[PDB]
Amino acid sequence: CPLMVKVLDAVRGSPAINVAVHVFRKAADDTWEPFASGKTSESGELHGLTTEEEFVEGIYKVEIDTKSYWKALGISPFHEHAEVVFTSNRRYTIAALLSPYSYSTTAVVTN
Amino acid sequence: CPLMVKVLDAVRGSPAINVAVHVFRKAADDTWEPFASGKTSESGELHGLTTEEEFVEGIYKVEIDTKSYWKALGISPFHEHAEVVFTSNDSGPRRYTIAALLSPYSYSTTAVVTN
Amino acid sequence: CPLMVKVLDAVRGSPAINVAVHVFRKAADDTWEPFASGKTSESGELHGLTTEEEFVEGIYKVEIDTKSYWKALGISPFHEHAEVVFTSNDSGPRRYTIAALLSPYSYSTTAVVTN
Amino acid sequence: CPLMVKVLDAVRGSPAINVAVHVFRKAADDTWEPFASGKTSESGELHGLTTEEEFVEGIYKVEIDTKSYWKALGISPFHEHAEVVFTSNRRYTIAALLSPYSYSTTAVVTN
């Protein structure tokens, strides 16, 4: 699998568990087509979203459902979600670090 | 003006100058409709995007064109742009500052919501 | 004043108000000697720490007392404080803004160096 | 080993390799005593700094030598180093994300 998502909780200093993630790919008509989805495990990681065969070149959007994560913990956060948009032309790790009013995201791209 | 955008460059240690910013509001049909736009100033800030009259409660998307910023510096970036999506709330007086800190393969964003 | 400190709270989405900040300069014997101190204002900023006359080239440490900030909010934090250590440089006119974004188990800091 | 350090490079989107790390522990005389040191591997991680037996309660400082990292890559960075100071009373991962004029650090504390 060439695409992994990892999410951390900056309030607790812990993996962000059970975070829903939806991946979209831009279609030829310039609309966002559903591509894959899943949720983070107890380690805060989401593996197996796709395969090398399926993950063709394109423009991808990884939507991390941060609002649902915070609301399930009893917190009213600022953002609806965190959206990570990039073109793929190799392994991509999309990492996110979450706080109620702030997030950071980094891409680690390796061979 | 109830909405301000501030952008910093973590590679140069500077304001991110002349970054394009496009703001959208979610319409009744669930599509994003254009709302306001501009480019950050010499201080990395974008003021005057809207007014209290127009900035009614809704879901807003602030799109920061990070890819073009890095390409103008001759630097290869990862993301197409940075998007900040939030619901505004009129529970009392409120100003929203959307702050972003940019690196080629990483960004952070924070909301500073004050009275 | 060539040195400003700005602190934001990523949990509340607000300036970090009344945060203690202590600045030190490295002495000739390699110890940290006190240089300036204060507390952030209602805007999360600390102005007037020093003057161009006193802020000569050297190695400076800016210590931000994050632990006491979180404890005053009733929130359990990880770090004792956040420290920012850098060498100043008089190559032309220069102002340093040390910005910090705080969460209980994480922080980021950026230097904005302008003319 | 109860203490791991992980470093990422936000310019390249890669692990930060060969980053020197020095850990200190506050002694009874309130001075910083050397505790352990090492450097990050090709994965950006530093394992085996200490043992459960050696890592007693105390105040620890993890100094990540960011200036030497950037200078070895031909870049003049802002900070001398990144310093992470915390009290230990369990596994600690100290993560850092580096840019020439900025860094972020997070603690992930697990059982």
Q: Which residues of A touch C101 (CB under 8 A)?
A: 102
Q: Could you tell me the end-to-end alpha-carbon distance of chain C, in angstroms, rounded to an integer? A: 12
Resolution in A: 1.4
Breaks (C-N over 2.5 A) in chain A follow: 89
Q: What does the alpha-carbon distance between residue C107 and residue B108 come to, in Å, rounded to a whole number?
A: 11
Give the bridge partners for C98, in sequence order.
Answer: C5, C111
What chain D residue is nearest to B78 in terms of C-alpha separation? D13
> Which CATH number fits the domain that encloses residue D105?
2.60.40.180
DSSP calls for B82-93: EEEEEE---SSS
Polymer length of chain C: 115
Total tally of structural domains belonging to chain A = 1
Q: What does the alpha-carbon distance between residue D3 and residue B72 come to, in Å, rounded to a whole number?
A: 41
Q: Could you tell me the end-to-end alpha-carbon distance of chain B, in angstroms, rounded to an integer? A: 12
Q: What does the alpha-carbon distance between residue B113 and residue B98 come to, in Å, rounded to a whole number?
A: 9
B76 CA to chain D: closest CA distance, Å?
9
> Checking phi first, is residue D18 left (phi over 0); if not, alpha (psi -120 to 50) or beta?
left
Q: What does the alpha-carbon distance between residue A25 and residue A6 come to, in Å, rounded to a whole number?
A: 19
* C93-to-C51, C96, C113, D76, D78 alpha-carbon distances in Å: 13, 10, 10, 18, 16
- Token pair, residue C24, equals 């030190």
Does the beta-carbon distance from D108 to A14 stay under 8 Å? Answer: yes
The DSSP 8-state label assigned to residue B10 in this structure reads T
Q: Which of A87, C6, D51 is nearest to B8 (CA)?
A: C6
**Amino acid making up residue D29:** D
H helices of chain B, in order, are: 66-72
Residue-number span of the structural domain to which C12 is assigned: 3-114
Q: What does the alpha-carbon distance between residue D27 and residue A67 come to, in Å, rounded to a whole number?
A: 44
Which D-chain residues 50-69 have CB contacts (< 8 A) with chain C? Answer: 59
Q: Which residues of C touch A104 (CB under 8 A)?
A: 108
DSSP calls for chain D: --EEEEEEETTTTEE-TT-EEEEEEE-TTS-EEEEEEEE--TTSEE--S--TTT--SEEEEEEE-HHHHHHHTT---SEEEEEEEEEE--EEEEEEEEETTEEEEEEEEE-
Q: Sign of torsion, CA D69 D72 D74 D79? A: positive
Q: In this structure, how many other beta carbons lie within 10 angstroms of the beta carbon of residue A73?
A: 14
Q: What does the alpha-carbon distance between residue B83 and residue B20 come to, in Å, rounded to a whole number?
A: 12
Residue pair D58/D86 in contact (Cβ under 8 Å)? The answer is no
Q: What does the alpha-carbon distance between residue B73 and residue D68 come to, in Å, rounded to a whole number?
A: 25
Which residues have C-beta within 8 Å of that of residue C36, sequence separation ≥ 6? C3, C22, C23, C49, C50
Flag whether residue D106 sits within 8 Å of chain B, measured between CB atoms.
no
**Is C71 marked as binding a ligand?**
no
Q: In this structure, how many other beta carbons lie within 10 angstroms of the beta carbon of residue C100?
A: 23
By Cβ distance, the residue of C87, C107, C113 closest to D105 is C107
Q: Sign of torsion, CA C109 C101 C19 B93? A: positive
